[PDB]
Amino acid sequence: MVLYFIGLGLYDERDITVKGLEIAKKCDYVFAEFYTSLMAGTTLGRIQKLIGKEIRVLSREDVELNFENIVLPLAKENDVAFLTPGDPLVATTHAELRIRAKRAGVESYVIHAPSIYSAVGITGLHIYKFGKSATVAYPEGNWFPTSYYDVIKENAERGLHTLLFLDIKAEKRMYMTANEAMELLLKVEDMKKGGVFTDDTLVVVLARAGSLNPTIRAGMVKDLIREDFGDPPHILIVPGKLHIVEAEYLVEIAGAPREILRVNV
Amino acid sequence: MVLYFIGLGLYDERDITVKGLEIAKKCDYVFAEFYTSLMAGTTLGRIQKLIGKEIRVLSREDVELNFENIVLPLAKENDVAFLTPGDPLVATTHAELRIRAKRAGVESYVIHAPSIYSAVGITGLHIYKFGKSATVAYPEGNWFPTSYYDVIKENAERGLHTLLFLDIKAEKRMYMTANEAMELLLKVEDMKKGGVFTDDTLVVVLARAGSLNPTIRAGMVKDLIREDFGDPPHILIVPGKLHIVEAEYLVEIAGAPREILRVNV
Ligand SMILES: Nc1ncnc2c1ncn2[C@@H]1O[C@H](CSCC[C@H](N)C(=O)O)[C@@H](O)[C@H]1O
Numbered sequence: 239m240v241l242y243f244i245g246l247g248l249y250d251e252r253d254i255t256v257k258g259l260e261i262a263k264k265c266d267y268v269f270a271e272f273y274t275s276l277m278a279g280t281t282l283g284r285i286q287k288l289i290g291k292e293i294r295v296l297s298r299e300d301v302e303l304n305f306e307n308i309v310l311p312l313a314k315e316n317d318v319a320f321l322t323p324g325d326p327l328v329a330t331t332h333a334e335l336r337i338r339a340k341r342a343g344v345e346s347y348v349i350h351a352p353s354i355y356s357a358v359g360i361t362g363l364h365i366y367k368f369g370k371s372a373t374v375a376y377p378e379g380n381w382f383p384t385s386y387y388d389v390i391k392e393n394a395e396r397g398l399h400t401l402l403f404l405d406i407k408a409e410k411r412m413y414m415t416a417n418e419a420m421e422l423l424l425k426v427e428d429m430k431k432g433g434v435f436t437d438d439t440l441v442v443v444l445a446r447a448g449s450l451n452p453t454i455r456a457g458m459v460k461d462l463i464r465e466d467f468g469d470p471p472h473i474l475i476v477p478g479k480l481h482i483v484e485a486e487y488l489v490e491i492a493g494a495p496r497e498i499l500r501v502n503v
Numbered sequence: 504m505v506l507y508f509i510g511l512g513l514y515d516e517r518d519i520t521v522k523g524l525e526i527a528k529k530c531d532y533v534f535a536e537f538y539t540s541l542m543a544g545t546t547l548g549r550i551q552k553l554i555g556k557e558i559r560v561l562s563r564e565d566v567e568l569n570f571e572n573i574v575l576p577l578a579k580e581n582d583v584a585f586l587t588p589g590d591p592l593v594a595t596t597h598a599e600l601r602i603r604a605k606r607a608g609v610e611s612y613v614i615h616a617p618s619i620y621s622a623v624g625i626t627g628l629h630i631y632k633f634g635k636s637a638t639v640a641y642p643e644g645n646w647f648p649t650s651y652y653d654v655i656k657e658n659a660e661r662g663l664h665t666l667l668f669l670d671i672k673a674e675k676r677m678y679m680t681a682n683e684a685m686e687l688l689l690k691v692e693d694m695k696k697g698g699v700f701t702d703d704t705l706v707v708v709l710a711r712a713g714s715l716n717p718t719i720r721a722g723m724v725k726d727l728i729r730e731d732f733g734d735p736p737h738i739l740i741v742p743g744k745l746h747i748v749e750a751e752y753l754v755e756i757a758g759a760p761r762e763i764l765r766v767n768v
């Protein structure tokens with residue numbers, strides 16, 4: 239008589255925790271959503287196969303409007319699981335869904351999974367040095383979001399790193415690339431001139447974490463902005479002040495210029 | 504031919520990903536360390552039974568001083584696995600090990616798993632609002648660290664949440680508790696009088712993340728400082744100004760005082 243929030247992990251269907259896989263198997267109903275992120279290494283088919291259940295996929299509307307009409311009821315009698323890419327509660331508004339469940343008399347449990355928020359550790363940057371985070375959103379119409387630019391600025395002054403989730407348009411099937419994100423920030427630099435993001439700023443790009451051969455590249459915008467990083471999902475990082483060892487990792491593992499090694503202490 | 508960095512997850516043996524188990528089982532040699540953190544929900548015996556291989560445990564010294572002599576050699580002619588709690592490379596000194604693997608001419612691949620960094624999402628706080636992270640260290644000798652206090656100050660100032668790791672004596676098997684951590688912050692407040700951590704400060708305590716029954720509690724320090732949060736590990740969080748939705752989750756889920764709806768929002 240419970241409902242389960244089970245993460246699916248970063249890349250393919252095997253990125254799920256054993257615990258999550260065994261609970262999903264003994265589940266009466268299985269729902270899922272694939273609009274919060276992109277699992278570029280699998281297919282609903284491979285997932286259903288690994289689970290041994292038919293998975294009913296929900297849209298953002300079904301969830302943000304009819305979660306308690308579509309899913310909660312079934313959990314007032316059976317054992318239902320809600321699957322999501324990566325960690326179900328990270329950089330999503332799903333947490334509020336738990337209150338819905340509560341208010342509906344349904345117990346909820348969270349089975350975590352590998353998230354991009356911690357996967358950044360593979361870039362060589364210290365996870366504790368990351369400051370506030372932000373999302374580079376696609377401008378739409380005459381509306382041009384810029385808040386993320388200020389986030390990058392704030393952290394930079396404190397010497398902290400910035401994690402930038404790139405935008406996604408699941409239904410339109412649009413997945414922002416690091417390049418597009420780099421382009422937008424340049425145009426925001428022009429508008430604001432805070433000297434926060436420029437052709438020289440060092441950036442880090444992580445593509446397809448969770449795959450066994452992800453793309454990890456570091457360098458100055460001008461040198462990376464026109465580079466092919468492979469298929470999405472992509473994630474962008476604007477480092478703050480580096481530690482020698484962070485720099486060494488970036489050069490030896492991310493192909494950055496042996497010059498960034500000279501940290502301007 | 505390769506060396507695999509595999510995360511074991513947060514609490515028990517089922518917290519490892521499916522991909523991680525398959526890879527580990529097919530490996531020739533399997534190493535693991537348990538000094539960065541401990542899996543309170545399990546034992547080395549259950550981990551060994553699950554993988555079905557003899558696991559050699561390495562000391563902090565073993566890794567930091569002789570990783571290239573104990574682990575890397577075997578990866579020249581075999582497929583070796585290095586197990587670590589959480590997500591690989593989230594521990595500061597861990598990323599550097601990949602640089603060694605390369606120089607020894609060894610190819611390395613990272614297999615992620617849930618980390619505490621992403622798992623705190625279960626507190627209801629928004630991930631993007633987390634600032635710099637810090638660790639509350641036990642004073643000892645003529646050494647009384649207080650930097651973690653400033654981290655909280657600079658974060659709260661900018662409306663950001665502070666994730667606070669508690670000190671662990673991994674060999675002695677002794678966990679710092681949320682309570683002990685609160686005591687320390689009170690003594691530090693009483694010394695720097697910056698009005699950062701007082702009896703009235705709202706804090707969140709997370710214990711045993713990763714289990715189906717973790718302890719999530721929120722309230723004023725004066726009301727939690729002597730509450731029983733169960734067995735370690737404990738994580739302490741000093742949230743910045745709350746988003747109403749956050750406040751609602753902490754109340755409805757973490758059983759927090761209604762006060763926060765008017766007070767901390
Ligand atoms: N495996 C992966 N590799 C690279 N980027 C990833 C990724 N998974 C998610 N991202 C990035 O994260 C943003 C989507 S936000 C969704 C995050 C997801 N809920 C989680 O917890 O992991 C996009 O920028 C997407 O590219």
Ligand SMILES: [Pt+2]
Pocket residue numbers: 239240315316317
């Ligand atoms: Pt039931």
Ligand SMILES: [Pt+2]
Pocket residue numbers: 411412413
């Ligand atoms: Pt497109």
Ligand SMILES: [Pt+2]
Pocket residue numbers: 438439458
């Ligand atoms: Pt430069």
Ligand SMILES: [Pt+2]
Pocket residue numbers: 504505581582
């Ligand atoms: Pt091989």
Ligand SMILES: [Pt+2]
Pocket residue numbers: 677678679
């Ligand atoms: Pt103790």
